[PDB]
Every structure is written in structure tokens, then in C-alpha cells.
Amino acid sequence: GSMLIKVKTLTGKEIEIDIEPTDKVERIKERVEEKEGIPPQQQRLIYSGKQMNDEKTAADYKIMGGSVLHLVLALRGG
Amino acid sequence: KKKRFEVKKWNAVALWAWDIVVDNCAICRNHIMDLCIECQANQASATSEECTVAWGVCNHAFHFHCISRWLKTRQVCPLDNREWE
Amino acid sequence: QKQYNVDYKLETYLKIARLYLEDDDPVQAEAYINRASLLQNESTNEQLQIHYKVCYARVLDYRRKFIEAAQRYNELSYKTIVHESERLEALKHALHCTILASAGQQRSRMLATLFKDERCQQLAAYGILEKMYLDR
Amino acid sequence: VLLRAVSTGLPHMIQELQNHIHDEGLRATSNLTQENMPTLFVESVLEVHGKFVQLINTVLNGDQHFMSALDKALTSVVNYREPKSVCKAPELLAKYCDNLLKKSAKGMTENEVEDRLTSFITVFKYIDDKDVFQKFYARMLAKRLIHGLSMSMDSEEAMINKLKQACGYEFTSKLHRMYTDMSVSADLNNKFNNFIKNQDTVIDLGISFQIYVLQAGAWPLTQAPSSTFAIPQELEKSVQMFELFYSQHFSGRKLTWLHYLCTGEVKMNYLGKPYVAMVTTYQMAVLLAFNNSETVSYKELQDSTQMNEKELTKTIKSLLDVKMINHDSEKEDIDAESSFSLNMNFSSKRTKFKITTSMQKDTPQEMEQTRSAVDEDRKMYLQAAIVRIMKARKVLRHNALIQEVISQSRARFNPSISMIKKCIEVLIDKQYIERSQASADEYSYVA
Ligand SMILES: [Zn+2]
Ligand SMILES: [Zn+2]
Ligand SMILES: [Zn+2]
């Protein structure tokens, strides 16, 4: 992964991940769940008060290294 | 008789809320002020302070499948201990 | 005008309640217990809370609301906190409702718990009902 | 001509136009607005309303960018003025209503008033604290409801139409039901005379039924404050027979108690004074506190106080100035050094009339009422910050969730640990987040 972004839970769990500048957040979800057991469909990716489309690229929302991919996510995985 | 401050004519007090709790059909808070999501979808005659408000046989004046919803969370409906309606 | 806290009014509610039940005017007391019902979120006096719970379940019996008090007395007498005399008394009223409540699948699983119940291994109609763990 | 065709020439003109329009708004909004009154406030800003209806209807005749621009900075200082209840001009507007919508004191003609009113409507795009103004205007109503700072009810009703179009909706009908409710106040005075025919006590005059229903939740703060009081027997009969009629009518709100309807009843009681010197509400209540005991220390009143003080400072001050008290201090209630007699003297026009002078003061009150606004604006800010979190990550737990919520807004203020439950509850209702099966805590996100 060329793009090293952060997937962040509601409590602030920002996770460092290697993705690409066109890497689908559809598969970024796959990455977050294959890494943290917390599955992505309650890792609801919201961008600035408005949801991130589960079927998009991270860089679609100018997401970068310290960017945030919102979970709101679950607790049992973690 | 020149002072003991006896009774003049006087003016009084009132309201009108209701003789019920009712707490906005607690199962959500699309209020009882509000036609909630499910019961804006169902919407009997329901208004900005009784979308459903009464000391009913339930007395849990809970929106149609919002009352059904918190009966979903427990089919024994102890909400006010009547089955979702 | 006079404000009481939960417990004095509540005292009167349970008082009214058990009284009319001794008088058997159940629905007046039903009116007022449903007024004392809601307060359950506020007061912490688990003692008097559950005095009120139990007059409720008494009513449920009186109301022919059998399973409801059945579930109540069942899960309530399951706990050692109560006078174990009074526990087994609720254990009666639970099972007395099990039988007085309809032939049920809730009741089937009830009766299954009751089969897994060890307390009633003392009891007489334990044996009776235990005959019927498999549909006697 | 040239920079419309020179086309970008114009946009620079609209630029520095926006600069002198704007900062002219800053100063001129800042200069004659020292007294902070409807005239200046409302008429300095509506004064520029003149400056640019007359500026811009003229030569001026198009660059609609000028339109959206003058509307833009005009709207901006519409939210950039002396408050932050910058409907203070709207406040002042209705306060203007207050000082003008009054049939006696500052009386005009409708369409004499209503010229001013349609100019208010001109601003109506810009009246911009509508529910700030609902809180504040329920207070205004507390200066209006029984009081009369709104003469032209139906001008206010068309204003209501405007609003419930683009503004608050049921505040309108709340005042409607209030209106018809004092209509019913007269009506049940009538029926009370019909039904009870209540010769309960010999002195039945004016014993209550005035009622002005704004919803119990329709009030800006708690009641017009009330406490213990004599309440002679007819007042009993009033509350109770009204409740006869009214429990017949409605139940759940009923004949509650509310002092600020109270006024003075000190008349031909048995007085060498021929005098009827009515007083304000707690003027009445505290003079009630001092009737028979021909003198009373701070301690004698302090026996049955169970209330606050300023009632009685207004009491002794109005009683000494008129010289209706043989007092010892005009203090908040009284010195223990000080005490209370009913003096006979009077200082005003009539047979001891116009002593009815509640001081009618708030600076200390202004701040007290400003407190209510903090709670409602913080709650709204929080509802949005909360739903937005709740959509992002579903926590979602109860306990851990609330803790994390605490983590996100460390800076803001100290919340209630309990009500954590309610917090999720609030989001459960909106279809924002649901309750999972797994725990009392640890729910799930929905929608
Ligand atoms: Zn709704
Ligand atoms: Zn309801
Ligand atoms: Zn439904």
C-alpha cells in the first residue's frame, strides 16, 4: 500500500494501513476487518459529518496518511 | 373600616398540557410532538403533543411500529406492560 | 400541593393496592398501581420496589394474567435475597401461574427451567409437574 | 456600462462597495448604538435599509451581484450585531411593538403602525433569532401576555403567517390558544357566576379567573415564581370550582399557582385612609406578610418566609416613598433592626393610586434569564455532534460510548455521568442509532 492512512474508531482508534491513492474503501474495509476483527459494516465510514461511501476510494475524499476512516464501529473486535 | 386589606377582585391561573406523562413515546425520540419515522409512515390522527399521548390500557403511548419496535426488543411488552399497539 | 418523595405516595399505592385486593376491587388498584408503576426508574429501594413488584404479580394472578406473574415470581424467587420461605412462596406462585398460564412454549421452556430447578425437589407437586416434563 | 460588457470592472466596484457597505456597517452599527434601543438598533440597521433601498433602487438599477452583496453583508451584520441575540432589533422590533403596540401609552393607527410593520417585514428576511426570539419573546409576552405590549394582535398574526412559513410554527398557535384562553377566562368567570354562584365569602370581586394558556412547556423558563401565600377561602373556591369546570374540560395541566398574576389588594379594609393602593404581585404577597402585626422584625417575617427577598425591598420602598409604611428599612426584606407598620400617608395623584410601582427591573434579572439560552444552544450543538459521532462509529456501547463521548469533548464542559443512558436514548428515538440485544450497554447503530 502506497497510501498509509488511518482508520479511526469512534473512541479514536486510528489504525495505520498501507493503501493506494485509488484504493477502494470497499477493500479498505476488508483491510480494517482482516486487521482488526471489528467488521466494517458497523465501521460506518463518515467524512466530516457525512458518510463516506463504502464503495469508494479513500483518496476520493482527499484521504491521506493522517486521514480518518470512521468506525461508527464496534467494540468486541479490539 | 379603613385598613385590614380585605378582599378585592382577583385573577387566576391555568394551563393547557395533559393528565398523562407522557414522555414523547420513549421508544425513540422522534417525539410525541413528532410524527416519528415509522409513524409518520403510519400516522393516525397524531399531533405535536399527542403523536400518541394518554394513560391508556397500555399507557405506554408508543408509536405504531415504534411501540412495535420496543415490543420487538421484548415481546413481553413491560413498557407500560401492554403489547405494542 | 404537598410533595412527597417516591416512597410515601408509593407506600399508599401499595397500601391501596393490597387492600382492594383483599377487598377484590382489582381495577381501582390497577388504576393506581399503574400510577406507581412508572416510578420504577427513580427509586432504588429494591425492598419496596419489589414489594410493589409482588403486589403487581398478585394482581396479574387476580387479573388472570398468569404467565406474566409466572415469569415474575419465577425469576424473582430464583434469587436468594428474599426470605427463602417467601422465596419458595413466590416459587409456588410462579409455578401456580405456570399451571394457571396457558399450555405454552414460553411455558415449555419455563417448565424446562423448572425441570432444571433443584429447589422444588423439596416440593410436593414438583413431583406432580415433573411427571409432565415430557407431556404427561 | 463598460465593465459590465468592461465586465469585470463592475465586480471590483461591487467589491469595495462591499467594503464600505460592510465596515460602514461595523462603525455605524457601532456608533449610535450605545443606548441599544429599537430606534437606533432597529432604525440604524433599518436606517441603512433606507440608505440602500434608496441607494440601490436608484442608479442603481441592476448588478444583481450588488443585490446579493448588500443582502450578503446586510445579512451578515444581521448576524453580526450587538448581541448574539441579534434579533435584539427583532426583539426591539417586538419591543417596538412592546413600546408601540399598546393602545394607550404609545398608541398609533394600524397602517400607521403597519407602515412601520411592513418595514419590519422588509427586515423579516433578516429577523434572525426566531427562537432566541421565542424564548426572549415569551419573556416579552411576560411583559405582553397580560400586559399589553402587543396591541395589533392580527398584525402579529400575519407576522405569524410569515414566520410559520419561514420561522417558528407553534409559538404562533401557542399565543392563539392563549388568546382564546383568556377569552375562556372571561367565559368561566361567567360560568362560575352561572354554576357555583359562589357566595363562598362575602367579598367575591375579582377572585380569579384570568387564564392565558401558553403551553406549560411553552414558557421561556420556569413559572413566574411562586411560593407560600395566604390564599383565603375564595381562592380555594376559585381553584377548585375552576377545576370542577376544567377537570370537566382538561386534566394534567390544571389550576396551578403563579404569583406574577398577583397584584395588591389593599383598599377600604378598615382604613382612616380612604385609599385603594394596589401593589404588584409580591408587593401583595409580602404586604400580606405584614397585615395585623403592627410591627414585624426581620425575624417575625423570617418565620414564614420560605421565599426570597426583593419582593419586600420593593415593598418597603414603595411603602415609604408613598409613605404607606411606617417601616424601619427599605432593605431586601428587612433589617432585624427594621420592621413594618401600615402608614396612612400617600404620595401620588388620587386616593392613594399610582403606588402600583414594581421597581420593573431585571440588570440582575437580565443575566438570570440569559442563563436559559446557554442550556438550549449547548443542547442543540450537542445533538448534532452526538448524531454525527453515532453515524460514524456505532458506540455502540452505552458506558464505553459515553466515556468516549466524554473524550471527544474534553474542552466543552462537565456532563452528567448518568443521563448517559438518556443520551443514547435520545439517539435511539430519531432512528439515529438503535438498541442492540447484547447489552443494556453495547447497542448498535441504525440508519
Ligand atoms: Zn419522527
Ligand atoms: Zn405516543
Ligand atoms: Zn407499523
UniProtKB/Swiss-Prot annotation, chain C:
It comes from the Eukaryota. It is found in: Cytoplasm; Nucleus; Cytoplasmic vesicle, Secretory vesicle, Synaptic vesicle. Component of the COP9 signalosome complex (CSN), a complex involved in various cellular and developmental processes. The CSN complex is an essential regulator of the ubiquitin (Ubl) conjugation pathway by mediating the deneddylation of the cullin subunits of SCF-type E3 ligase complexes, leading to decrease the Ubl ligase activity of SCF-type complexes such as SCF, CSA or DDB2. Also involved in the deneddylation of non-cullin subunits such as STON2. Belongs to the CSN4 family. Component of the CSN complex, composed of COPS1/GPS1, COPS2, COPS3, COPS4, COPS5, COPS6, COPS7 (COPS7A or COPS7B), COPS8 and COPS9 isoform 1. In the complex, it probably interacts directly with COPS1, COPS2, COPS3, COPS5, COPS6, COPS7 (COPS7A or COPS7B) and COPS8. Interacts with TOR1A; the interaction is direct and associates TOR1A and SNAPIN with the CSN complex. Interacts with STON2; controls STON2 neddylation levels. Interacts with ERCC6. This is COP9 signalosome complex subunit 4. It comes from Homo sapiens (Human). The lineage of its organism: Eukaryota, Metazoa, Chordata, Craniata, Vertebrata. The gene is COPS4.
UniProtKB/Swiss-Prot annotation, chain D:
Neddylated; which enhances the ubiquitination activity of ECS (Elongin BC-CUL2/5-SOCS-box protein) E3 ubiquitin-protein ligase complexes. Neddylation leads to structural rearrangment in the complex that allows interaction between the E2 ubiquitin-conjugating enzyme and the acceptor ubiquitin. CBC(VHL) complex formation seems to promote neddylation. Deneddylated via its interaction with the COP9 signalosome (CSN) complex. Residues 377-437 form the Cullin neddylation domain. GO terms for cellular component: Cul2-RING ubiquitin ligase complex; cytosol; nucleolus; nucleoplasm; SCF ubiquitin ligase complex. Keywords: Acetylation, Host-virus interaction, Isopeptide bond, Nucleus, Phosphoprotein, Ubl conjugation, Ubl conjugation pathway. It is found in: Nucleus. There is a cross-link at K391 (Glycyl lysine isopeptide (Lys-Gly) (interchain with G-Cter in NEDD8)). One of its GO terms (molecular function) is ubiquitin ligase complex scaffold activity. The Cullin neddylation domain restrains the RING domain of RBX1 in the E3 ubiquitin-protein ligase complex; this restraint is removed upon neddylation of the cullin. Core component of multiple cullin-RING-based ECS (ElonginB/C-CUL2/5-SOCS-box protein) E3 ubiquitin-protein ligase complexes, which mediate the ubiquitination of target proteins. CUL2 serves as a rigid scaffold in the complex and may contribute to catalysis through positioning of the substrate and the E2 ubiquitin-conjugating enzyme. The E3 ubiquitin-protein ligase activity of the complex is dependent on the neddylation of the cullin subunit and is inhibited by the association of the deneddylated cullin subunit with TIP120A/CAND1. This is Cullin-2. It comes from Homo sapiens. The gene is CUL2.
